């Protein structure tokens, strides 16, 4: 597939385990984040001693305890262990996932 | 040009007016942000009524539009925000769309 970068949020829908999630394609993030509001309560999370630094800093975010199988509509698949953060507006697909999708950025 | 998305920071070097800047390709941002530490003090700044929701800041912004030019002589205009205490300049979709950049997988 091919998606041009525009003023609109570049968006991707895929399965994480057996659930469908939609998120923002974010080459600006090293890691993937799922908003807690979207996180299935039966999926275990863990504390981390990591820091998520950007415009500000989110200390000790939770993370998926297990790796998740990500799958796209063409049945490409792989593993990611996303962070799970409250008060976020969108899920964020980070480069940890995007690199597994062999995504290129190209200008004409 | 062609750049694969990897674990390494995807990076772009270009001219803003007559100065060279290097920054992170950041499809997650609508707007472009230059770290104040890199901002030439003689380039005028203004307050904004904007709010930048992050992982929250009220940025200052370039008072004038800047000509961006890339190494292939593509060019255009952006009015970036200027924020201190940032590690990298962030090229946002305001710039990235003017460059006609595509995302593609095989």
């Amino acid at each position: 597939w091919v998606q041009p970068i525009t003023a609109q949020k570049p968006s991707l829908t895929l399965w994480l385990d057996d659930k469908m999630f939609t998120g923002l394609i974010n080459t600006g993030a090293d890691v993937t984040i799922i908003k807690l509001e979207d996180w299935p309560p039966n999926w275990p999370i863990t504390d981390t001693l990591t820091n998520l630094r950007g415009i500000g800093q989110s200390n000790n975010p939770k993370q998926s305890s297990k790796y998740l199988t990500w799958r796209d509509k063409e049945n490409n698949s792989g593993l990611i262990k996303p962070f799970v953060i409250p008060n976020l507006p969108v899920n964020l697909w980070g480069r940890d996932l995007l690199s597994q999708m062999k995504i290129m950025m190209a200008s004409p | 040009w062609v750049q694969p998305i990897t674990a390494q920071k995807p990076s772009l070097t270009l001219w803003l007016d007559d100065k060279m800047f290097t920054g992170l390709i950041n499809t997650g941002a609508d707007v472009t942000i230059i770290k104040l530490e890199d901002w030439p003090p003689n380039w005028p700044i203004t307050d904004t009524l904007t709010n930048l929701r992050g992982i929250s800041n009220n940025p200052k912004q370039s008072s004038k539009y800047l000509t961006w030019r890339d190494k292939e002589n593509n060019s255009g205009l952006i009015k970036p925000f200027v924020i201190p205490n940032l590690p990298v300049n962030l090229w946002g979709r305001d710039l990235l769309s003017q460059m006609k950049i595509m995302m593609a997988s095989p």
Partner: peptide, 7 residues
């Protein structure tokens, strides 16, 4: 890790 969403 670094995270840049600024809707």
């Amino acid at each position: 890790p670094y995270v840049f969403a600024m809707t």
